[PDB]
C-alpha cells in the first residue's frame, strides 16, 4: 500500500528476504515501476512513546 | 481458526463492527473447513435500544449483522460458529433459539 | 434509613409549582369526559364512562354518579379509587352539618371542606393528593342551583357550564356557542348529549356507556327530585333527542 494511496501487487524482488516482509514492514519501493527495493526500520508514534 | 474476542471489534465509527464480522465471514466462506470462534459475545450482547445512543444501535446492528450471515440469503456451508458466553443472562433469546 | 428512600415528593419547583399536582392533572386527562350544565330549573350531569365492554355490567353501575346528600350529587372524572375516599368524607360531612344545625348543607360549604383535604396533603405528610376532578350539582335555598368544579390542588371555581376530564377544551368551546341563560333542563339534556357525541372517547356514544342524572325542581311543591336515569331510560331520551 503506497503513501500515494494505491494498492499494488508486486512480484517479489530477489534482493530482500521473505522473512523481513511482514504485515506493516515499512519498505522502500522503486519510484518509477513499483518493486520492493529495500526495507526500512519501523517508525513509532507519540502514542507508542508514553506507554513504553 | 479465527480466535476473536467480541469486545475487540467495537469502534465508535458506526458499522465498523458490522464491517468486521462481515469480512471475517467472507474469509470463512472461502477458507472452508473453518470454525469462527466468537469469544465473549456477551460484550456486544443485550437487546432493545432506540432510546439509547447510536453506539448501542451499532452494537444492535452488529448483533443483527451476525444474524444476517448465519441465516438469510447467506448460509453456513462448512462454516460454523462457536459462540462463548460467560454469563448466559447477558445473552439474548434470539441467539438461544 | 427512612430519609434514604424519600425524594421530597411534595415541594415547589423554581416556577413555584407543585410536582404532584402537575402530574395529577395528566392522570385526570386519561379519565373520561364529564360535563355539567346549569339550567334555570336544574343541573344536568352527564358523563361518559372510561370503560365499556359487552361483558361489563353497566346497568347497575353508578361509577361516576354518586349522591353525597339528598340535594347534592357529584359526577367523577379521575381515579375512581381515589374519589371513593372523598365521596364517603362528603357524606359524613353533610350529615354532620344536618346533625348540628338541622339544616341542609349549602353547596359552597361541602366543596370547600373537600378542597381543604387536597391542599393539606401537599402541605404536610408527603402524601399524594387525590387525582380527581368533580363537578358538583347542588341545590340550596340561598343561591339556588350552584355548579362547581374542583381541581386536584384543592381549589373550587363556580361555573354555568363546564367540563372536566378528557376533552375539556373541545367540550368547552361547543358550550360557549350553544349556552344561553334561557335554557331549561329539557334544553340542557339535549345539549349535553350533542356535546358528548362530538367529544366521544371512542368512535361511538351509547346509552350503556352514558350515565345521566338531573336534579329538578319540577317535583311538586318546589321540592327537588334527584333522578339518576337507568341506561334504558337514557335510551328513551337517546331517541328523543335524535342521537340515535
Amino acid at each position: 500500500k503506497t503513501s500515494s494511496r494505491q494498492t499494488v501487487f508486486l512480484p517479489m524482488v530477489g534482493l530482500v528476504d521473505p522473512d523481513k516482509l511482514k504485515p506493516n514492514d515499512l519498505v522502500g519501493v522503486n519510484k518509477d515501476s513499483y518493486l520492493i527495493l529495500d526495507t526500512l526500520p519501523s517508525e513509532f508514534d507519540s502514542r507508542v512513546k508514553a506507554m513504553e | 481458526f479465527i480466535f476473536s474476542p467480541a469486545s475487540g471489534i467495537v469502534d465508535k465509527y458506526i458499522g465498523e463492527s458490522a464491517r468486521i464480522i462481515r469480512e471475517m465471514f467472507a474469509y470463512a466462506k472461502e477458507h472452508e473447513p473453518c470454525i469462527i470462534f466468537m469469544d465473549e459475545v456477551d460484550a456486544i450482547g443485550g437487546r432493545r435500544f432506540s432510546e439509547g445512543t447510536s453506539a448501542d444501535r451499532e452494537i444492535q446492528r452488529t448483533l443483527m449483522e451476525l444474524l444476517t450471515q448465519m441465516d438469510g440469503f447467506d448460509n453456513l456451508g462448512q462454516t460454523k460458529i462457536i459462540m462463548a458466553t460467560n454469563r448466559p443472562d447477558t445473552l439474548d433469546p434470539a441467539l438461544l433459539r | 434509613g427512612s430519609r434514604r428512600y424519600d425524594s421530597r415528593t411534595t415541594i415547589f419547583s423554581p416556577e413555584g409549582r407543585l410536582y404532584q399536582v402537575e402530574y395529577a392533572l395528566e392522570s385526570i386527562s386519561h379519565a373520561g369526559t364529564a360535563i355539567g350544565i346549569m339550567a334555570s330549573d336544574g343541573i344536568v350531569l352527564a358523563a361518559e364512562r372510561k370503560v365499556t365492554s359487552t361483558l361489563l355490567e353497566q346497568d347497575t353501575s353508578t361509577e361516576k354518579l354518586y349522591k353525597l346528600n339528598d340535594k347534592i350529587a357529584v359526577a367523577v372524572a379521575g381515579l375512581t379509587a381515589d374519589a371513593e375516599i372523598l365521596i364517603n368524607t362528603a357524606r359524613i360531612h353533610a350529615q354532620n352539618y344536618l346533625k348540628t344545625y338541622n339544616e341542609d348543607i349549602p353547596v359552597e360549604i361541602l366543596v370547600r371542606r373537600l378542597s381543604d383535604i387536597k391542599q393539606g396533603y401537599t402541605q404536610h405528610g408527603g402524601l399524594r393528593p387525590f387525582g380527581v376532578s368533580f363537578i358538583y350539582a347542588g341545590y340550596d335555598d340561598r343561591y339556588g342551583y350552584q355548579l362547581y368544579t374542583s381541581n386536584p390542588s384543592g381549589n373550587y371555581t363556580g361555573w354555568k357550564a363546564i367540563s372536566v376530564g378528557a376533552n375539556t377544551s373541545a367540550a368547552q368551546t361547543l358550550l360557549q356557542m350553544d349556552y344561553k341563560d334561557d335554557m331549561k333542563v329539557d334544553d340542557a339534556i339535549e345539549l349535553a348529549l350533542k356535546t358528548l357525541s362530538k367529544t366521544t372517547d371512542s368512535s361511538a356514544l351509547t346509552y350503556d356507556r352514558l350515565e345521566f342524572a338531573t336534579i329538578r325542581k319540577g317535583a311538586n311543591d318546589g321540592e327537588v327530585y334527584q333522578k339518576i336515569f337507568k341506561p334504558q331510560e337514557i335510551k328513551d331520551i337517546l331517541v328523543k333527542t335524535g342521537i340515535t
Binding site: - | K12, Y13 | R17, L25, N151
Partner: protein
C-alpha cells in the same frame, strides 16, 4: 417645471461633455506606443505567459525569494520576479504565479477574493437611528461603547481609564440586533464592514484563518470603522460528524479571532460588533470581561415598547382604517417585535383571502389566534387554581 429645467441644464452638459472627451482619448492614447510604453508592456507579457495560476504569499525570505501556497495541494519555494517586488508586496496578498515554472510574475488581483467582496462596504449603513426606533435603552448601551470613543476618544483620557473595546449583542431573538448593528454605525459617521461568520468556516486547511486575517487588514485602512461579524454564534462550537469530523477547523478560526481583538493594537478604532444568541452558543473559552467590554442584554419588549414597534409596521400597511392600535396591545401580552411583524402580514393574507380591500380589527384577532396558538399554557391555572 423650472426646477426640472435647471437640473436638466447641468446634468446634460456634464455627462455629454465627458462622453466625447472619453471617446477621443481612447484613440489619442493608442496612436503613440513608441518609446517607454511599448518596451514596458512587452517585457511584462514575456515574463508572464498564459495561463496564470492564483497564488498566495505566505512570507518573504530576505534574499529576493518567497514562500507561496498554491490552490493545489503542494506548496512551493519561489523567486520574486518582475515589476512587483517584496517592497510592493506584503504578506497575505494574492499573487499571480506562472503555471509551468512557479515564480511570482505579477499581480492583478491585489487581494481580491469572493469573501473580500461580501465583507467590503465603505458606504453608510442602510438603517439610520430609530428606523430602528425604540429598545432605546439598549441603543443607550451600544452607542456609549461604539459611537462615543470614535467621536471623541478624549473623553476617556480625561476620565482616566482605558477606552471601551467591542460589544457583545446577546439575548433574546427577535429584538433585531441584526438590524440594530446597522442603526448605530450610521449615526457615528464611520465605515461599516459586514461579514457573516458562516463564510469563515471552510473545509479547506489554513483557509479558515486567512479569511479571518483579511478583515482586520481592511478595517485598519478605512479606520475609523465598525466591523460587524454577524453571528459569531455560528462559528460556535458545533460538529458535523464525529466519525469523519469537521470540528478541527472551527477551533482554529475561533482562536484567530480571539487574538486580533486586543492583538490588532489597543484601539477603540477597530471596533467589533459580535452578535450572538447566547454566550453558551459560543466556544466557552473566552477573552476577559473588559476586552469585549459591556455585554448588551436583549430582552422582550414591554407593553410601551411594542406599541412603538407595532406602530411602525401598520403605517406601512395600507387600508387599515378599521384598526385601532391600542386594542391590539390590550389583548396581547409581551412579545417580540418579530411576532408583531408576522401578525400584520398574516392579517393582510386573511383580508386578501376574503376578497375585501379593508383590514378590520376583527381580522387582527384571527391573526393573534394563529400566532399564539401553540404557546398555550394550562399549568398557569394548574398552579393558580
Amino acid at each position: 417645471t423650472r426646477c426640472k429645467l435647471k437640473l436638466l441644464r447641468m446634468e446634460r452638459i456634464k455627462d455629454h461633455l465627458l462622453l466625447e472627451e472619453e471617446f477621443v482619448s481612447n484613440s489619442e492614447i493608442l496612436k503613440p506606443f513608441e518609446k517607454k510604453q511599448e518596451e514596458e508592456k512587452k517585457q511584462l507579457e514575456e515574463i508572464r505567459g498564459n495561463p496564470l495560476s492564483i497564488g498566495t504569499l505566505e512570507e518573504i525570505i530576505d534574499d529576493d525569494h518567497a514562500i507561496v501556497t498554491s490552490p493545489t495541494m503542494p506548496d512551493y519555494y519561489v523567486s520574486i520576479l518582475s515589476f512587483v517586488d517584496k517592497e510592493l508586496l506584503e504578506p497575505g496578498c494574492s499573487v499571480l504565479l506562472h503555471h509551468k515554472t512557479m515564480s511570482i510574475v505579477g499581480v492583478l488581483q491585489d487581494d481580491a477574493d469572493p469573501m473580500v467582496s461580501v465583507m467590503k462596504m465603505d458606504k453608510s449603513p442602510t438603517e439610520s437611528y430609530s428606523d430602528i426606533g425604540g429598545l432605546e435603552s439598549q441603543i443607550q448601551e451600544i452607542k456609549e461603547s461604539v459611537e462615543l470613543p470614535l467621536t471623541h476618544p478624549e473623553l476617556y483620557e480625561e476620565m482616566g481609564i482605558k477606552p471601551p473595546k467591542g460589544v457583545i449583542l446577546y439575548g433574546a431573538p427577535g429584538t433585531g440586533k441584526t438590524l440594530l448593528a446597522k442603526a448605530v454605525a450610521n449615526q457615528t459617521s464611520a465605515t461599516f464592514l459586514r461579514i457573516v461568520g458562516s463564510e469563515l468556516i471552510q473545509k479547506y486547511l489554513g483557509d479558515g484563518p486567512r479569511l479571518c486575517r483579511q478583515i482586520f487588514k481592511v478595517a485598519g485602512e478605512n479606520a475609523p470603522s465598525i466591523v460587524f461579524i454577524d453571528e459569531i454564534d455560528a462559528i460556535g462550537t458545533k460538529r458535523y460528524d464525529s466519525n469523519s469530523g469537521g470540528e478541527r477547523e472551527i477551533q482554529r478560526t475561533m482562536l484567530e479571532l480571539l487574538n486580533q481583538l486586543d492583538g490588532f493594537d489597543d484601539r477603540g478604532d477597530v471596533k467589533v460588533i459580535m452578535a450572538t444568541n447566547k454566550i453558551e452558543t459560543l466556544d466557552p473559552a473566552l477573552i476577559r470581561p473588559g476586552r469585549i467590554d459591556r455585554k448588551i442584554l436583549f430582552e422582550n419588549p414591554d407593553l410601551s415598547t411594542k406599541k412603538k414597534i407595532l406602530g411602525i409596521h401598520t403605517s406601512k400597511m395600507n387600508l387599515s382604517e378599521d384598526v385601532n392600535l391600542e386594542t391590539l396591545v390590550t389583548t396581547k401580552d409581551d412579545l417580540s417585535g418579530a411576532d408583531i411583524q408576522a401578525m400584520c402580514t398574516e392579517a393582510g393574507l386573511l383580508a386578501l383571502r376574503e376578497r375585501r380591500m379593508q383590514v378590520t380589527a376583527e381580522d387582527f384577532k384571527q391573526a393573534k389566534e394563529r400566532v399564539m396558538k401553540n404557546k398555550v399554557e394550562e399549568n398557569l391555572e394548574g398552579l393558580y387554581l
